[PDB]
Amino acid sequence: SRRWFHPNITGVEAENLLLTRGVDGSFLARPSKSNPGDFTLSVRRNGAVTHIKIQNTGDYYDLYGGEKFATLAELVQYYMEHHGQLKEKNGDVIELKYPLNC
């Protein structure tokens, strides 16, 4: 199924879509314009949207740091199930609560 992965969407369309179709805690994954091959998590927090870059080497998936995963689903479900491990410099956690779908 992998319904949270939107294959044909820009970051600004995703950013708008989360503020219409989702709630705080909603999120999705997209293919990333800035670096083809990579992916990007787009999450909603406190009425606004944050974007997180995901490195795909070919060998593994990661967030330019942290735990490394064999597949993208393993990475997304990991950070869903371990909420505190996704933190920003500020100190705030970024929570992947509710997947948004096609």
Binding site: T10, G11, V12, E15, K33, S34, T40, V49, T50, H51, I52, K53, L63, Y64, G65, G66, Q85, L86, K87, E88, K89, I94
Partner: peptide, 10 residues
């Protein structure tokens, strides 16, 4: 576009 948040790790 809009910026990508700066993630930190233990």
């Amino acid at each position: 576009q809009t910026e990508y948040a700066t993630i930190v790790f233990p």
